Amino acid sequence: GALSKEILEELQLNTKFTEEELSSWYQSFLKECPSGRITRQEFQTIYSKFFPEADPKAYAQHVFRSFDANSDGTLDFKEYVIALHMTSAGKTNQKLEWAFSLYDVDGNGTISKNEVLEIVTAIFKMISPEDTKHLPEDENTPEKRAAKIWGFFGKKDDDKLTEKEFIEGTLANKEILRLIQFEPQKVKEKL
């Protein structure tokens, strides 16, 4: 019952985890989750446990949605590993399509102004109140951060932000990168 070659290959292209590491992790995953599927509540519990200083429910729910790629209401091992990797490992620039999916809350193919606010707020809640005191003054509340992102993209209130533009802007404008950042440790390291 080893993890398949096909899934191993995909995971190794999309993360830097090794085959040995992934295969070992998967065997324990199955022992603890014998259906090979994690529910949203179970995923939330992981983030509740490992961010005790934060309020991670909203963030974990958005991450779950983003990585439940077949929309079946559970994460399989592949989806779960990619989700954990998104929040906690690897380089931002290799994740920008997933970042787009995170920000496109309703999945309609574009990001709206309110979606930016929703996701920025969920991310902001991953930071301890103590660490927020060290954010730049003009970037120290979700409202300021979200408004600034929208302004950096040059958008009218009812405009729709495409993935093409999202990726361009996050690559080119390092201030956009800073503000859209979704890995809690990177938001912290930056401040």
Interface residues with Ca ion (CB under 5 A)? 68, 70, 72, 104, 106, 108
- Rounded to a whole number of angstroms, the minimum distance from the CB of residue 79 to Ca ion is 5
Whether residue 76 is annotated as binding a ligand: the answer is no
Residue 170 CA to residue 158 CA, distance in Å, equals 21
Q: Among residues 11 and 135, whose Cβ is nearest to Ca ion?
A: 11
Whether residue 68 is annotated as binding a ligand: the answer is yes
Whether residue 110 is annotated as binding a ligand: the answer is yes
Chain-centre distance for alpha carbon 51: 15
Q: H/E element holding 105?
A: none
Whether residue 114 is annotated as binding a ligand: the answer is no
Residue 173: C-alpha distances to residues 65, 90, 107, 139, 181 (Å) = 27, 20, 24, 16, 13
Residue 98 CA to residue 78 CA, distance in Å, equals 14
Q: Among residues 54 and 64, whose Cβ is nearest to Ca ion?
A: 64
Q: Contact 152/175 with Cβ under 8 angstroms? A: yes
- Rounded to a whole number of angstroms, the minimum distance from the CB of residue 125 to Ca ion is 21
Q: Among residues 127 and 146, whose Cβ is nearest to Ca ion?
A: 146
- Rounded to a whole number of angstroms, the minimum distance from the CB of residue 89 to Ca ion is 20
Q: Among residues 106 and 143, whose Cβ is nearest to Ca ion?
A: 106
